[PDB]
Structure 1
Amino acid sequence: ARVREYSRAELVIGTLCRVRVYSKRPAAEVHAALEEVFTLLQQQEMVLSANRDDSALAALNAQAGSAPVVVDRSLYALLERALFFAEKSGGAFNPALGAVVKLWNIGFDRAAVPDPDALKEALTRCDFRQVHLRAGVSVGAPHTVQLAQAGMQLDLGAIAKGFLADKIVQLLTAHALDSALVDLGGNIFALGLKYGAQRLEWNVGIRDPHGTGQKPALVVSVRDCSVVTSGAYERFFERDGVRYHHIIDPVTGFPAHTDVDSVSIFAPRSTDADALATACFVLGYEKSCALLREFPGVDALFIFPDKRVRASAGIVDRVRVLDARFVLER
């Protein structure tokens, strides 16, 4: 049995999703697995999307301030984890920010900042402590979500790719695959080891925050790890000389003003890395380091505006600088 390398990529969940696999299984078995990967991504776009009218999440949002809504166990577990990170981060990650983000999302499409009062009114409808998850303990009891606060809107944009990465890994493993690189719009899971037969860690790139994005600034060797990066220049609009990026500080209702240009989180679960990367970007370096003390199994890499890079002890030895303008502090 020979090792063969496969890759498939599609536009789905609003971005480029690619999976690369090394396997000695019959090719028809890899092909079936990859068919299922991209079917899952299509199906889940219709569960999770905050910017289609026809998703499960949109239907849930169209019921805020009313009665509990039944959701599948998958979505329920995602919401549970999201509310967990909202609590732990002190609301720096907030999965009930849709009132605010939708005010800004229209701002992107036409390069205009929301509106003082409107933005203030929106911030009153983002209390994630008013999302009530309940699931009976009897056989086959349904999972339900209640949005108690009128006009509150869920938006799982900052955790859904992680969730989907984790679900893809689980599917790959179900297909007896154990070597893959999953890349959902830059949200990476490195499953197993790659082949060089010599087995080697995956070398995950971290971009220059201000790059044209073509090339990484740094590379980190990892196994069985998600790598998720949040940054200040990944998605933004400009108006009157001011850049407005997509990661909102829930306290201000404006794009977060922070002391880091990017934060990359390394975790066994991509769900966690995705939430935490967004939380840490909002929180800034010192407060991030205190939060991450809560999560001893996670590592982190910060790129500062002066191009210094600090990485936690679990990963610093695995970092290689490719763009010599950056400096890795040790």
Structure 2
Amino acid sequence: ARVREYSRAELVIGTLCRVRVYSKRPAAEVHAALEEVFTLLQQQEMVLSANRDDSALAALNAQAGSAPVVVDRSLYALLERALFFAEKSGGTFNPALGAVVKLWNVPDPDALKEALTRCDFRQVHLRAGVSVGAPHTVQLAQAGMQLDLGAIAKGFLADKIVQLLTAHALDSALVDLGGNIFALGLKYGAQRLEWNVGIRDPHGPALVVSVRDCSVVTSGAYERFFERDGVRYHHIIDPVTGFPAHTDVDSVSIFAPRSTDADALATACFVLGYEKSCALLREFPGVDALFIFPDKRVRASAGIVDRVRVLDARFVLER
């Protein structure tokens, strides 16, 4: 049985999604798995998207202030994890920030102060009965509050894809959802090697990190922004100010066995800045982190620093 390499990519969930697979299984089996990957992404766009009017999330937001809404167990589990990170991050990750995000999607100061009164994630009530077949429900108790899962959905979907690939007996893959990476297993050279994941120059890869069975997710200011009167406004909001976060790092990359967790923590850490991020990350010892600073210094945690290679010599890896 010969090793074959396959890839497939499509525009879906608002970005370019690519999956690369190495396998000795029959090609028809790999093709079927990749078909199901991209069917899954299409279906989940219709569940999770905060920027379509016809998604399940949009339907849920339309019921803010009203009765509990039945959701499927997958969406419930994502919300559960999002609220966990909201609590652990001290609200710097906030999945109930849609009222503010939608205004930035420069907004007026009062209009903005008003939106900030409708972002209390502690008013998202998840309830699920314990008896057989009991429904999962979500209630948004604060009128006008709006969920936005943009800071965790790609991580969640990368995890779901890894689960699907493994269900199809695939153990070597590179999942790339708009730069939200999961490195499954080892790649092939007959040698088996770690996947080499590049991290971009925030102002541009600058660095490459060798990983196995690991998600690599980066949050940064220069991923998405607009400019007005000489000021840049990026897409990661500080929930305290309602404005794009002022932070001492240009990007944070999180390395975690679950992409859901890497994505949420990457956003939280960006808002928190370097010193508070290191404190938070002590609570997640199975996670590693790499920080790129505006002066092009790079700091990486002990679990990954020996796997980091600088490709752009303007950057310096502190050891």
TM-score normalised by the chain length of structure 1? 0.96
Separation in 2, partners of 1:143, 1:301 = 37
Separation in 2, partners of 1:115, 1:254 = 11
Separation in 1, partners of 2:189, 2:304 = 21
Superimposed CA distance per residue, residues 185-229 of structure 1 (whole angstroms, 9 cap, x where no aligned partner): 00000000000110000000000000xxxxx00000000000000
Separation in 1, partners of 2:107, 2:2 = 57
Separation in 1, partners of 2:252, 2:75 = 26
Report the 3-state secondary structure (helix = DSSP H, G, I; strand = E; otherwise coil) of the residue aligned with 2:284.
coil
Separation in 1, partners of 2:259, 2:221 = 20
Matched, 1:264 2:257: no
Q: Identify the residue that residue 34 of structure 1 maps to in structure 2.
A: 34
Q: Identify the residue that residue 21 of structure 2 maps to in structure 1.
A: 21
Pairwise CA distance, 1:250:
0.0
Pairwise CA distance, 1:60:
0.1
Separation in 2, partners of 1:144, 1:114 = 33
Superimposed CA distance per residue, residues 224-253 of structure 1 (whole angstroms, 9 cap, x where no aligned partner): 000000001110000000000000000000
Matched, 1:195 2:184: no
* Structure 2 counterpart of 1:127, from 115, 120, 130: 120
Separation in 1, partners of 2:182, 2:154 = 10
Separation in 1, partners of 2:147, 2:212 = 33
Report the 3-state secondary structure (helix = DSSP H, G, I; strand = E; otherwise coil) of the residue aligned with 1:11.
strand
Q: Identify the residue that residue 4 of structure 2 maps to in structure 1.
A: 4
Separation in 1, partners of 2:163, 2:91 = 29
Pairwise CA distance, 1:147:
0.2
Report the 3-state secondary structure (helix = DSSP H, G, I; strand = E; otherwise coil) of the residue aligned with 2:137.
strand
Report the 3-state secondary structure (helix = DSSP H, G, I; strand = E; otherwise coil) of the residue aligned with 1:249.
coil
Separation in 2, partners of 1:232, 1:15 = 17
Separation in 2, partners of 1:291, 1:47 = 30
* Structure 2 counterpart of 1:276, from 255, 265, 268: 265
TM-score normalised by the chain length of structure 2? 1.00
Matched, 1:254 2:243: yes
Separation in 1, partners of 2:152, 2:52 = 17
Superimposed CA distance per residue, residues 12-35 of structure 1 (whole angstroms, 9 cap, x where no aligned partner): 000000000000000000000000
Matched, 1:142 2:135: yes
Pairwise CA distance, 1:165:
0.1
Report the 3-state secondary structure (helix = DSSP H, G, I; strand = E; otherwise coil) of the residue aligned with 2:222.
coil
Separation in 2, partners of 1:250, 1:51 = 20
Report the 3-state secondary structure (helix = DSSP H, G, I; strand = E; otherwise coil) of the residue aligned with 1:248.
coil
Matched, 1:46 2:39: no
* Structure 2 counterpart of 1:293, from 250, 258, 282: 282
Separation in 2, partners of 1:133, 1:62 = 17
Separation in 2, partners of 1:90, 1:129 = 11
Superimposed CA distance per residue, residues 277-315 of structure 1 (whole angstroms, 9 cap, x where no aligned partner): 000000000000000000000000000000000000000
Separation in 2, partners of 1:232, 1:150 = 30
Pairwise CA distance, 1:115:
0.4
Matched, 1:174 2:167: yes
Report the 3-state secondary structure (helix = DSSP H, G, I; strand = E; otherwise coil) of the residue aligned with 1:82.
helix
- State percent identity of aligned pairs: 100
Report the 3-state secondary structure (helix = DSSP H, G, I; strand = E; otherwise coil) of the residue aligned with 1:233.
helix
Separation in 2, partners of 1:38, 1:138 = 34
Superimposed CA distance per residue, residues 243-275 of structure 1 (whole angstroms, 9 cap, x where no aligned partner): 000000000000000000000000000000000
Separation in 2, partners of 1:127, 1:104 = 18
* 5+ residue gaps, structure 2: none
Report the 3-state secondary structure (helix = DSSP H, G, I; strand = E; otherwise coil) of the residue aligned with 1:182.
strand
Separation in 2, partners of 1:251, 1:56 = 28
Q: Identify the residue that residue 304 of structure 1 maps to in structure 2.
A: 293
Separation in 1, partners of 2:86, 2:113 = 20
Report the 3-state secondary structure (helix = DSSP H, G, I; strand = E; otherwise coil) of the residue aligned with 1:163.
helix
Report the 3-state secondary structure (helix = DSSP H, G, I; strand = E; otherwise coil) of the residue aligned with 1:140.
coil
Q: Identify the residue that residue 73 of structure 1 maps to in structure 2.
A: 73
Report the 3-state secondary structure (helix = DSSP H, G, I; strand = E; otherwise coil) of the residue aligned with 1:94.
coil
Report the 3-state secondary structure (helix = DSSP H, G, I; strand = E; otherwise coil) of the residue aligned with 1:144.
strand
* 5+ residue gaps, structure 1: 106-112, 211-215
Report the 3-state secondary structure (helix = DSSP H, G, I; strand = E; otherwise coil) of the residue aligned with 1:151.
coil
Pairwise CA distance, 1:69:
0.1
Pairwise CA distance, 1:59:
0.1
Superimposed CA distance per residue, residues 12-66 of structure 1 (whole angstroms, 9 cap, x where no aligned partner): 0000000000000000000000000000000000000000000000000000000
Separation in 1, partners of 2:30, 2:223 = 33
